[PDB]
């Protein structure tokens, strides 16, 4: 029961940068690598008195990688496990996919092979990347292709970061996003979206941080991935493995785009005035004000939903709450599926990082659903791709790197087919 986690790009490293802080804190591992079996899914016990993680930070710019090499966790990782090139990809899909990827990907995947060979009960991979950049999207795509031809039958959970509808820190990311999805369709198995506008609104509304930085985003994302991998780590009344996600959430092999959510995101003081029970956190996990992707599922129809529960929850009232939800009329389920829930319970309450902004709560919920509001997201990105492509803007960069107009037109029509598929299935 071991899952190795690769991180691609500037956002991937910083997300995993908070993830591994959380993991060392949940298993009490000192930053120099030793404790003062449950951890076996993440930290391999090497030699004696040493636990090295099953991850690879890989990037093309050396700035953040060697910031890790200088930081507090020098002694935690390998020295050889933090891959880093010499020059960036510069928000350029073709540059990251055909020029520099061709030299960095071979060392990368010939490192993951002996990580997988060290493993014995590999559950699957999970990838962290943002499609807005060049390293995250470009060699991210290239790596996922070569993983699919190497292992194939193993799961590849993808926690991607799409561009928000209006928030954006680049210009060409629509080109990068569309070129990225043409491989994100048929190479990742279970793809969980994570916009940034939604997490900004959560941090402003719930945690009442008036000045949130990327660290707070990374910290609560780490809470989500830790909450859905705690089914493997910590023991509960009724828990699932990685193979249950693709079994109960993917009705068709091309419809895998999961809205994520979490509850309760609550500060220290708002907690005093609010009761945190199973009823309201299961209700509040379905309000669009507590999802991690900006889309309105009131316009969509739920296809399948999964609910990870942590803490002190016995199945009587979690069965009651999912019963009330099924009777509600605000949200609708698809005709194609009458019983659309998959509950899972875990004993360990979610931990807290000292200095974090989250309260120490005794019970939490990590909801991962499927809808057609994703069918709204792809169109909202399709429009602002077609604006720029109608004038042939920024194209000469990708063509100079070695691509052509064919990949633009065919990746655009791939998104069109995906849209047609979502409007068909939603009926």
């Amino acid at each position: 029961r071991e899952v190795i986690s690769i991180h691609i790009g500037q956002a991937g490293i910083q997300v995993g940068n908070a993830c591994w802080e959380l993991y060392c804190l949940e298993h009490g591992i000192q930053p120099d690598g030793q404790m003062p079996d449950a951890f076996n899914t993440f930290f391999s016990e090497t030699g004696a008195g040493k636990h090295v993680p099953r991850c690879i930070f890989l990037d093309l710019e050396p700035t953040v990688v060697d910031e890790v090499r200088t930081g507090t966790y020098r002694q935690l990782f390998h020295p050889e496990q933090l891959i880093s090139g010499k020059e960036d990809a510069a928000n350029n899909f073709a540059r990251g996919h055909y020029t520099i990827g061709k030299e960095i990907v071979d060392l990368a995947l010939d490192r993951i092979r002996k990580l997988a060979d060290n493993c014995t009960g590999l559950q699957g991979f999970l990838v962290f990347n943002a499609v807005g950049g060049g390293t995250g999207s470009g060699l991210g795509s290239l790596l996922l292709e070569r993983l699919s031809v190497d292992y194939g039958k193993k799961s590849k959970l993808g926690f991607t970061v799409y561009p928000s509808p209006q928030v954006s820190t680049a210009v060409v990311e629509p080109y990068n996003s569309v070129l990225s999805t043409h491989s994100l369709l048929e190479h990742t198995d279970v793809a969980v979206m994570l916009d940034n506008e939604a997490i900004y609104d959560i941090c402003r509304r719930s945690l009442d941080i008036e000045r949130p930085t990327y660290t707070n985003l990374n910290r609560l994302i780490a809470q989500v991935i830790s909450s859905l991998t705690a089914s493997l780590r910590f023991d509960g009344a009724l828990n699932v493995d990685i193979t249950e996600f693709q079994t109960n959430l993917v009705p068709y092999p091309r419809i895998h785009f999961m809205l994520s959510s979490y509850a309760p995101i609550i500060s220290a003081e708002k907690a005093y005035h609010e009761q945190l029970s199973v009823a309201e956190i299961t209700n509040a996990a379905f309000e669009p004000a507590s999802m991690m992707v900006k889309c309105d599922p009131r316009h969509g129809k739920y296809m399948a939903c999964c609910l990870m529960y942590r803490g002190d929850v016995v199945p009587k009232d979690v069965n009651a709450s999912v019963a009330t939800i099924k009777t509600k009329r605000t949200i609708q389920f698809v005709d194609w599926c009458p019983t659309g829930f998959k509950c899972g319970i875990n004993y360990q309450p979610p931990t807290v990082v000292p200095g974090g902004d989250l309260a120490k709560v005794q019970r939490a919920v990590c909801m991962i659903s499927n809808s057609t509001a994703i069918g709204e997201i792809f169109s909202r990105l399709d429009h602002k791709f077609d604006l720029m492509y109608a004038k042939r803007a920024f194209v000469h960069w990708y063509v100079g790197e070695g691509m052509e107009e064919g990949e633009f037109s065919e990746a655009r029509e791939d998104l069109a087919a995906l849209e047609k598929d979502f409007e068909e299935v939603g009926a």
Partner: protein, 426 residues
């Protein structure tokens, strides 16, 4: 690891570069004698980009100072921070250019450019991973424009894939130094549209405007103008030199700003710049930085951006700040001014954050807006050039040297069709 090779041409280039290396050396904590004396070890980790270790903490700049007359470099070396430059990097001319583009590009470049190419080639292959070259020169002078231009042509001929930044000061009719300003500027822009990767336009009008409206100085000597250009140059390459939340390297910036291969003339602005009498009545927040950034009184070009449309823009922030306020501020200033931003590009603003502000400041920012109002400056240059060229003023000091008139006619055609396509995209 990524290396910036600095190149200074001419009088303005040498004096701008003198203040530039003074500011950069201060940021990296190296004292004027050449030894490291910083406090945090953040500074050591990224001085390969700008210095080479000589002997026992002796770091020397990676600069090449060229001109056709050692008159400016004598004052450069005589001043403070003079012993840092390596004596081999200086290059010499005994004749002198004299505002004559032909003298700077055909007769004296013909024997000067081989030696400086040897120096640049040596300094470029000493390092391992080039990031690109960075040039400071003028567009009115002779040895700045002419020599600098031929160097751009030769370098882009030999090392075509590396980046190249050109800080060029352009002439204005009100701040009109030379009389052949159009004859030099027109030929120089004609070369820069075909050789340079991106050009950041400077000019002394907007620099005086900044020093009198914002700074409200009394006697703004050239040292202060050269400092403003210096603070801009440092702010551009900040993200290479310090760790950031969202890094932006030179190539990253060029690809986010240049939509079409000919549209690479940017107008620049720096912030915060407030008088010492008004540093009491103000605060320092991201709104205070953005309100001052997008103001047209804080540009460094003689082209009002609200005479046209912003094609794209970029903002490099420095200091510990909140990316939420950064993003919502860029989004607000884009939604509220719906007429100054082009329609067929959504989210016209690229942003990036770095975590080390300049010494003594809490928070800073630098702006690079690829607008379409830059063709107004090209019109006020092109129309002067026709006014003189119609009747052959000053033309013989060029024609009698080897240059043909077709270089002038062609320079006018590229200037004219380039402003035609700027006007098309607006």
């Amino acid at each position: 690891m990524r290396e910036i090779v600095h190149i200074q041409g001419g009088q303005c280039g040498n004096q701008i570069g003198a203040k530039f290396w003074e500011v950069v050396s201060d940021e990296h904590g190296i004292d004027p004698t050449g030894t490291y004396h910083g406090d945090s070890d953040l500074q050591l980790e990224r001085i390969n980009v700008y210095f080479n270790e000589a002997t026992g903490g002796r770091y020397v700049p990676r600069a090449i100072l060229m001109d056709l007359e050692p008159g400016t470099m004598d004052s450069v070396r005589s001043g403070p921070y003079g012993q840092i430059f390596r004596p081999d990097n200086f290059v010499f001319g005994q004749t002198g250019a004299g505002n004559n583009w032909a003298k700077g590009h055909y007769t004296e470049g013909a024997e000067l450019i081989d030696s400086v190419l040897d120096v640049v080639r040596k300094e470029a292959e000493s390092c391992d991973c080039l990031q690109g070259f960075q040039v400071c020169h003028s567009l009115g002078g002779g040895t700045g424009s002419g020599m600098g231009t031929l160097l751009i042509s030769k370098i882009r001929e030999e090392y075509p894939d590396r980046m190249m930044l050109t800080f060029s000061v352009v002439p204005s009719p009100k701040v009109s130094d030379t009389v052949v300003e159009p004859y030099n500027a027109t030929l120089s822009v004609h070369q820069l549209v075909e050789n340079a990767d991106e050009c950041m336009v400077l000019d002394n009008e907007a620099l005086y405007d900044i020093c009198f409206r914002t700074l409200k100085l009394t006697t703004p000597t050239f040292g202060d103008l050269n400092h403003l250009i210096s603070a801009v140059m440092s702010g551009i390459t900040c993200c290479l030199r310090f760790p950031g939340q969202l890094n932006a390297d030179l190539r990253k910036l060029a690809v986010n700003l240049i939509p079409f291969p000919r549209l690479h003339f940017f107008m620049v602005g720096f912030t915060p710049l407030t008088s010492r009498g008004s540093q009491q009545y103000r605060a320092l927040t991201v709104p205070e930085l953005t309100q001052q950034m997008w103001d047209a009184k804080n540009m460094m070009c003689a082209a009002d951006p609200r005479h046209g449309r912003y094609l794209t823009a970029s903002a490099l922030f420095r200091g510990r700040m909140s990316t939420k306020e950064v993003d919502e501020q860029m989004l607000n200033v884009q939604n509220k001014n719906s007429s100054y931003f082009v329609e067929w590009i959504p989210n016209n603003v690229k942003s990036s954050v770095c975590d080390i502000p300049p010494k003594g400041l809490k928070m800073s920012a630098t702006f690079i807006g690829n607008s379409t109002a830059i063709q107004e400056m090209f019109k006020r240059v092109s129309e002067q050039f026709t006014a003189m060229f119609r009747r052959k003023a000053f033309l013989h000091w060029y024609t009698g040297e080897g240059m043909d008139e077709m270089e002038f006619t062609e320079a006018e055609s590229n200037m004219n069709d380039l402003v035609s396509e700027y006007q098309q995209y607006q």
